[PDB]
Amino acid sequence: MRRPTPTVYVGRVPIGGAHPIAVQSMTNTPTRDVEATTAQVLELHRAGSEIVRLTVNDEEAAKAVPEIKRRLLAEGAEVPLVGDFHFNGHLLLRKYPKMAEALDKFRINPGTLGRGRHKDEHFAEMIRIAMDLGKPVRIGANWGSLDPALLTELMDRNARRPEPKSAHEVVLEALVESAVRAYEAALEMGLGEDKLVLSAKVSKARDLVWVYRELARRTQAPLHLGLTEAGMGVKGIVASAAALAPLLLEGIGDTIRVSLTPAPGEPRTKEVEVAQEILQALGLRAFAPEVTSCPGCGRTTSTFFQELAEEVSRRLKERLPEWRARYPGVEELKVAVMGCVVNGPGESKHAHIGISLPGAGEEPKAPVYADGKLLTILKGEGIAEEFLRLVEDYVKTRFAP
């Protein structure tokens, strides 16, 4: 189902229909703070952020970028950097060529280029710089910063229709048009199709789906997909997954970013985890072993089952660094931990390896299945440690080099 697109290299990372969907994120430290920003780029990259964006908002930020890059490279960290430009990107790129060169990609927002005639000139200057330096660009529209002149143009087109659409629908048309027009203008200037990524983000899931279907149809470019301003906590996580899944399953989207608001003191790597979970849930990429477990019900003892499931999950997380190094393919491992005989054996047979605890009315023994067939039956104390040993033995055999 994957939409074909040209490949756009962002540093060493290829983006497009022929490549895995790349996970990205954005820093939240002040870019002028070289120490804090370098540390957080490294943190995000180590969590799985294949590309990292940072705001390049003012001259102090611009002056910091080459140093951040130098420090990354000194540790052998090859993480591509995307500069986020608004209002003054043309001035910062012009004035600070070492910043322009140190970035791996420029983001432009067609709605933050300035007013009237100035918008076209500013756009052209940034595209010129990118062309001169061989850099890729994302043309990223966002409905929080929609070009007002385009909105009026589309509102007038709407008003001439025999059956005008709602104001909200016209906003979405304008957002798509903003990105498409800017894409076509960049191509016309001579920027290559191997240098252009597009996005057009809204904060409501159902709207996002509409928008990206239009962008996918109307353009050839790789698409950067995300639900902007998703918010805090569970709501942010749910909204992000809900918005992305329909599109991802239809084959639309080449890189994703999850726009979560961190709780105070929550690490900025949560968004990377959520991004990875979305792709893995959909069978698009595999990052780490996963545990399938039942909710538990009145058929099982709640504490014991919940404790075991949690213990298995924690052990897999502990073993992963080593495993990733020794056992190619282990990222695909599926482990089941189940509460009773109703679905326990069947679900366990669908995992690589799984355990079915005894629930109410059952003899106190726990079958273990691997590769769809009975492996052993556990009893007594120490079920969890025995099971984890069996998972280790399984991994070493199944994912051996």
Summarize as ranges the residues that interact with ligand H6P (CB under 6 A): 84, 109, 140, 142, 145, 199, 201, 226, 228-229, 257, 259, 294-295, 297, 342-343
* Interactions with a second copy, residue window 219-238 (CB under 8 A): 228-235, 237-238
Residue 137 CB, shortest distance to ligand H6P, in Å, is 13
Instruction: Return the DSSP state at 49.
Output: -
Beta bridge partners of 180: none
- Count CB-CB contacts under 10 A for residue 230: 24
Residue 43 CB, shortest distance to a second copy, in Å, is 14
SS3 content of the chain, % helix, strand, coil (to 5): 50, 15, 35
> What is the tally of helices (H) and strands (E) in the chain?
13, 17
User: From residue 309 to residue 348, what is the string marking binding to ligand SF4 with x (rule CB under 6 A)?
Assistant: -----------------------------xxx-xxx----
Residue 330 CB, shortest distance to ligand SF4, in Å, is 26
Beta bridge partners of 156: none
Question: Look-up: residue for tokens 């983000």?
Answer: 201
Residue range at the interface with ligand SF4 (CB under 6 A); choices 71-79, 130-138, 267-275, 289-297 = 289-297
Distance in angstroms (rounded) separating the CA atoms of residues 299 and 360:
5
Q: Is 350 in the site for a second copy (CB under 8 A)?
A: yes
Beta bridge partners of 243: none
Q: Is 292 in the site for a second copy (CB under 8 A)?
A: yes
Select the residue interacting with ligand SF4 from 253, 296, 354, 367 (CB under 6 A).
296
Residue range at the interface with a second copy (CB under 8 A); choices 43-51, 54-62, 179-187, 321-329 = 54-62
Select the residue interacting with ligand SF4 from 45, 299, 319, 352 (CB under 6 A).
299
Q: Is 31 in the site for a second copy (CB under 8 A)?
A: yes
- Which two structure tokens, joined as six digits, stand for 91? 């001035």
Helix, strand or coil for residue 86?
A: coil
Select the residue interacting with ligand SF4 from 104, 359, 366, 391 (CB under 6 A).
359
Q: Number of residues interacting with ligand SF4: please give it, by CB under 6 A.
A: 13
Q: Which is nearer to a second copy, 195 or 299 (CB)?
A: 299
Distance in angstroms (rounded) separating the CA atoms of residues 46 and 56:
22
Helix, strand or coil for residue 170?
A: helix
Residue 266 CB, shortest distance to a second copy, in Å, is 8
68, 69, 75, 77 alpha-carbon torsion, rounded to 10°: 120
Q: Is 178 in the site for a second copy (CB under 8 A)?
A: no
Distance in angstroms (rounded) separating the CA atoms of residues 375 and 372:
9
The reply, when asked if residue 307 is annotated as ligand binding, is no
Tell me if 275 sits within 8 A of 311, measured CB to CB: no
- Which two structure tokens, joined as six digits, stand for 177? 């048009």
Residues belonging to the binding site are 294, 297, 340, 347
Q: List contacts with ligand SF4 (CB under 6 A).
A: 294-297, 299-300, 338-340, 342-344, 359
Residues belonging to the binding site for [4Fe-4S] cluster are 294, 297, 340, 347
